[PDB]
Amino acid sequence: LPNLRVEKLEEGVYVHTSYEEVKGWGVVTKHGLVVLIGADAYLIDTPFTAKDTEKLVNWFVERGYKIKGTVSSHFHSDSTGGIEWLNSQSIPTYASELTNELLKKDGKVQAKNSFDGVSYWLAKDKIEVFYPGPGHTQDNVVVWLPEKEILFGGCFVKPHGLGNLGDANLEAWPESAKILMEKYGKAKLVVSGHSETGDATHLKRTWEQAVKGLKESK
Template sequence: MNKFISLALTLGATFSAIAASEMPKFDIKPIGKGVYQHTSYQDVPGFGVVGSNGLVVIENQKAYIVDTPWSVEDTKTLVDWIQAQHAEVKASLSTHYHEDRTAGIAWLNEHGIATYASSLTNQILSQKGKPKATHEFRSEREIHVAGSNLEVLFPGGGHTKDNVVVWIPNQKMLFGGCFIRSNGAKSLGNLKDATVSTWYQSLEKVTATYPDIQFVVPGHGESGTSALISNTKQLVEAKLHADQTSH
């Protein structure tokens, strides 16, 4: 019996090492002038290894984080990287309350870095006993968030009831977060907290507000053109149709 236990432990350790080696490392890449995409990874039950995208926008050596990485460790790594670029971390903003957007809030708060979220996001975080952002935006559309060039728009519910998008006007770049699916996505992903019934109208509001979008960064998957928004609309329509025919 001891031999079997020993073998099981050895195999378990081996498979754990293989799984760890397959987990991609946190990475940062430039996607525009002074704009960088950061991607962190977690093994999510039912989905496997998932990459989560956020941004760093650097303006005049001041850095703004759009969505924290998915762990405290990766948040520290990101801040270290920003400081290595000789930039000051001025603020972060989270596009909704899920952990892939907010995992670093507590650490940033502890280190005196301003954190921003909508009043609705903060309300939900508080209800769930999670650390809140230190600053709130309350209106539907906020410009010059934290003194930056960034705009925040609440288009209506979609992936969650509190999701917002971030617009970088001088780059004509939209950070859609989990509200926008990648071109490669075949489904709407995690719908546990979604408001699918309003998602299409919310997407329409984004394109009406920003008709000249040239580049879109989704919360998960590859960035691309405004075709990502069209793909998300198609996925929403397919989901609504499937729900109707199933009743």
């Protein structure tokens, strides 16, 4: 497998890409962000592993950044795998109350800090965690960077197909996607967990895929 990749998207915003061999299934490629605000770095999703979470943290700590906080966009291991390691390093971890409940139900380590607001703001006015409603999972949130007009759609944004529906809410996905398109249609870039970054048409495409997926299910 490829090693952890970190690439600059633009000033202050990096995409981290990690790779997992899923036994009996195939290989999963997962994108998240590192967001720099002054001398602080925020991880938007952890890699699958403690190993890769540490490599990612060390890359930014060696450039002088504090890892100020991490946000997990949903309970799946491709957003949360590194939480236990981060908690051991006293790096504040955040996830919604629902995400923490789903982690606990699967016997996984919880984020230290939780929230249930529909919007939760980090770095005062620079990092918005938003819940559009169920889709890919019950608990999926997106992360908006208003100063860059970049949306981290995570694993909710699926412009080319819905992927694994095991934990999905197909009935809710269309409305959640319509809510997301209506609020973040001004987006310059939409970063997805499993596909290449796109423009704001990734939101409409996800809505189309969710509508199509629901209808095929019926």
